[PDB]
Design a protein around this ligand. Structure first.
Ligand code: NAD
Ligand code: NAD
Ligand code: GDU
Ligand code: GDU
Lengths: 304, 304
C-alpha cells in the first residue's frame, strides 16, 4: 500500500511521514520545499497550485496536508489558491489516478465562533476567516468526491497541534519575539483568548487510528475532531514560554478589534469535543494543553 | 442605488434586470455574452474567471447569477472555475470596491439527496454533484465575507426555475429532442424522479422581496429556499411537453446508474420547504409545478 503525504516536509506531515515509514507503508512525500530526512520515502518537489502537480505520482491513499496554515483578510487570494485550488487539484489527481481515500487536514476554524464549546462535529460551518472558509470548502469538495466517485474522504478537524519542527503559531511567535527583544512581549488581543493544544505525538496517533478505522467503515465521508480536552489562555501561554526562556518580559497588550480579538477573523475561544474520536478508536491524549504548550516551548527553545 | 447583476444576460438574471429597471434602480449588467434588450441598464461584457473582471465597475449591491448551470463529473474543472473561482472573484471585487451586499444564486443541489423532503434550510450540505459542491462552497465563502468584511450575503437556494428564455434543463431538452425526432423521446433515469418547478415571475418576486427584507435584517448571512410547493415526475413532464407540441412519441427509458438516476450526481427527488420565505415576505407561488411546466413548454415551444 502506497501512501502519498502532501505537505510531507512540514510540521504535521513530516511527523506523519516518519510514523508511516516505521509501520511498513511505502511512503511518498510531495511538498514544495525539500526535506531530506532519510528513510524509505520517495521524495517529490511539486506545487499543488499546478493542476499537473501529480503527473507520474501514484498512491492508494493520500494524506493532504499541503496548505498555507496562517489565519492572519489582507491577502485572501493566496489563501484561495493554496487552500482551495490546491485541494481541488489534489482531488482531481485522486479521481483520475485511482486513489481510494483522501485524509484531509481540516481545522477547528471551520466552526468559527462556535455556539457550543466543546464543539461537536454536528456544529455547522460558520467560519470567520478566509482560511476557515477554505477548509470548509475543501471538506465539502472532498465529501462530494467521496459520494460521486468513491474517493472516500476523512476530514480531520485539528485544534492546535504543537511539537518539534513547528514554525508557525503563538508559541513559535512568542519565542521569536523574546529572541529579538527579551524585555517586551507584544500580545495581540485582550489576553483572554482560550484554546486547546494537542502535542504532535498525540495528533499523529489519533490521525492514524481514525484512518485505520475509517477504512473499515463504509461512510463515503467522515469529519472528525482531533484536539485536546482542555484549553489555555494566551496570557498563560506567554508565561510558560517566558519561564522556559528564564525571562520576565513586559507584557504589552495590542488592541486590534472592538471585541478583543488579535485580528479580524481570530476565533477567541475554542475547544473541540473528541467523544467521537475516543469512541471510534480508544484514543486519549497523553498531555494537557499546558503540558503540550510547555513541552513545545522547550522543543522550539532548543531548535530556535 | 446601483445594482450590479452578474449573468445579467441569462435566464433568471435578465428577468431580474428588467424588473429592477422598472422599480427605479440604476442597473448594471455584467455577462460574458451580449444582450441588448433596451432600457436604462449599463452594459458590460466581462469574464468573471478573470480576477480583474470588475475593473471600473461600481455598485452598492450585487446579484451574482453568473455560473455554468449544467449539473451533468466529466469536466469538474470548468465547474470549478465557472462556479468557484468566479464567485471568489466576485466577492473580492465586492470587498475592495465597497459593495454592501451580495445576493448569491445558490441551488437545491447543495442538499444532495436530502433526508427531509420538503427540505428545510437547516439541512446540512450533502451535495452529490461537483456543481452542488461549488454552490455550497460559494455559500460558505460569501457568508464568511459577510462576517469578516461586512459584505452581507443573501444565499438564495433555488429549486428549478422555469419560463421564457430558459435554454437549459429538462423542458428545454425534451422540446429540442422532439424537434429533431418527434417519434422518439429518450428519458434519462427510471422515469420516477420528482422535482418542483417555479415559474420565473414567481422566482423573481420571491428574490426581490427576500432581498428587500434581508436589507432590514442585520444577520450577516441568510440562506433562503426559493422553490414551488409541489413536485412533478419526469414522465409527467415528458407528457406535458409532448401534448403542447401535439405529439405522442415513443418514450424510451435510458438506464444510467444502478439506482435509476439520469447520470451520476443527479438528485432523484427534490422539493424545498418555503416556510421561511413565506413567513419573512408574505410571498406565495401563483402556479403549481404542473402549470409552470406547461406554461414554460408553451413559452419555449413558440421561442424554439
Ligand atoms: N498545526 C496545527 O495546529 C494545525 C491545525 C489545524 C489544521 N492544520 C493543517 O495541517 C496541515 C499542515 O499544518 P502544519 O502546521 O504542518 O503547517 P506547515 O506549514 O508546517 O506544513 C505545510 C506544508 O505544506 C507545504 N506546501 C504549501 N503549499 C504547497 C503547495 N502549493 N504545493 C506543495 N506543497 C505546499 C509547505 O511547504 C509545508 O511544508 C495544513 O493543512 C494545516 O492547515 C494544522
Ligand atoms: N434556472 C434555475 O432553475 C436555477 C436553479 C438554481 C440555481 N440557479 C442559478 O441561477 C443562476 C443563473 O441560472 P440560469 O438558469 O439563468 O442560467 P443561464 O445560463 O441562463 O444564466 C447564466 C449567465 O451567466 C453567464 N456567465 C457564465 N459564465 C460567465 C463568466 N465567466 N463571466 C461572465 N458571465 C458568465 C452566462 O453567459 C449566462 O448568461 C446560476 O447561478 C444558476 O446556477 C438557476
Ligand atoms: O503572535 C501572536 C499570535 C497569536 N496570538 C493570540 O493567541 C491566540 C492563538 O491561538 P492559536 O494557538 O489557535 O493560534 P492561531 O489562532 O494562529 O491558530 C489557528 O490556525 C492554526 C494553523 O495556523 C490552526 O488551524 C488552529 O486550529 C487555529 O486555532 C489567538 O487568539 C491570537 O489572538 C497572539 O496574541 N500573538
Ligand atoms: O434530458 C433530460 C434531462 C433531465 N432528465 C431527468 O429529469 C430530471 C430533471 O430535473 P431538474 O428539472 O431538476 O433538471 P436538472 O436535474 O438538470 O436541474 C438541476 O440543476 C438546475 C440548473 O441547471 C438547478 O440548479 C436545479 O436546482 C437542479 O435540480 C432529472 O432527475 C433528470 O434525471 C431527463 O430524464 N432527460
Amino acid at each position: 500500500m502506497r501512501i502519498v503525504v502532501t505537505g510531507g516536509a512540514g510540521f504535521i506531515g513530516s511527523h506523519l511521514v516518519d510514523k508511516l515509514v516505521e509501520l511498513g507503508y511505502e511512503v511518498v512525500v510531495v511538498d514544495i520545499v525539500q526535506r531530506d530526512t532519510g528513510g524509505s520515502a520517495e521524495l517529490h518537489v511539486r506545487d499543488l497550485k499546478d493542476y499537473s502537480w501529480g503527473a507520474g505520482i501514484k498512491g492508494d491513499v493520500v494524506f493532504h496536508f499541503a496548505a498555507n496554515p496562517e489565519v492572519r483578510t489582507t491577502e485572501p487570494i493566496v489563501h484561495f489558491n493554496e487552500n482551495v485550488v490546491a485541494t481541488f487539484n489534489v482531488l482531481e489527481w485522486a479521481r483520475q489516478t485511482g486513489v481510494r481515500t483522501v485524509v484531509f487536514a481540516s481545522s477547528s476554524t471551520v466552526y468559527g465562533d462556535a455556539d457550543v464549546i466543546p464543539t461537536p462535529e454536528e456544529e455547522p460551518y460558520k467560519p470567520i476567516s478566509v482560511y476557515g472558509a477554505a477548509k470548509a470548502a475543501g471538506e465539502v469538495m472532498c465529501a462530494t468526491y467521496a459520494r460521486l466517485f468513491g474517493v472516500r474522504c476523512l476530514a480531520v478537524r485539528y485544534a492546535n497541534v504543537v511539537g518539534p519542527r513547528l514554525r508557525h503559531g503563538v508559541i513559535y511567535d512568542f519565542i521569536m519575539k523574546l529572541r529579538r527583544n527579551p524585555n517586551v512581549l507584544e500580545v495581540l488581543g485582550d489576553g483572554t483568548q482560550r484554546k486547546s493544544y494537542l502535542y504532535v505525538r498525540d495528533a499523529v496517533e489519533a490521525t492514524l487510528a481514525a484512518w485505520k478505522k475509517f477504512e473499515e467503515m463504509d461512510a463515503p465521508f467522515l469529519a472528525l475532531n482531533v484536539g485536546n480536552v482542555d484549553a489555555v489562555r494566551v496570557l498563560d501561554i506567554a508565561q510558560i514560554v517566558a519561564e522556559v526562556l528564564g525571562l520576565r518580559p513586559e507584557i504589552r497588550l495590542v488592541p486590534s478589534t472592538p471585541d478583543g480579538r488579535g485580528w479580524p477573523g481570530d476565533v477567541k475561544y475554542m475547544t473541540l469535543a473528541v467523544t467521537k474520536l475516543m469512541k471510534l478508536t480508544g484514543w486519549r491524549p497523553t498531555m494537557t494543553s499546558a503540558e503540550a504548550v510547555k513541552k513545545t516551548a522547550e522543543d522550539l527553545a532548543k531548535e530556535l
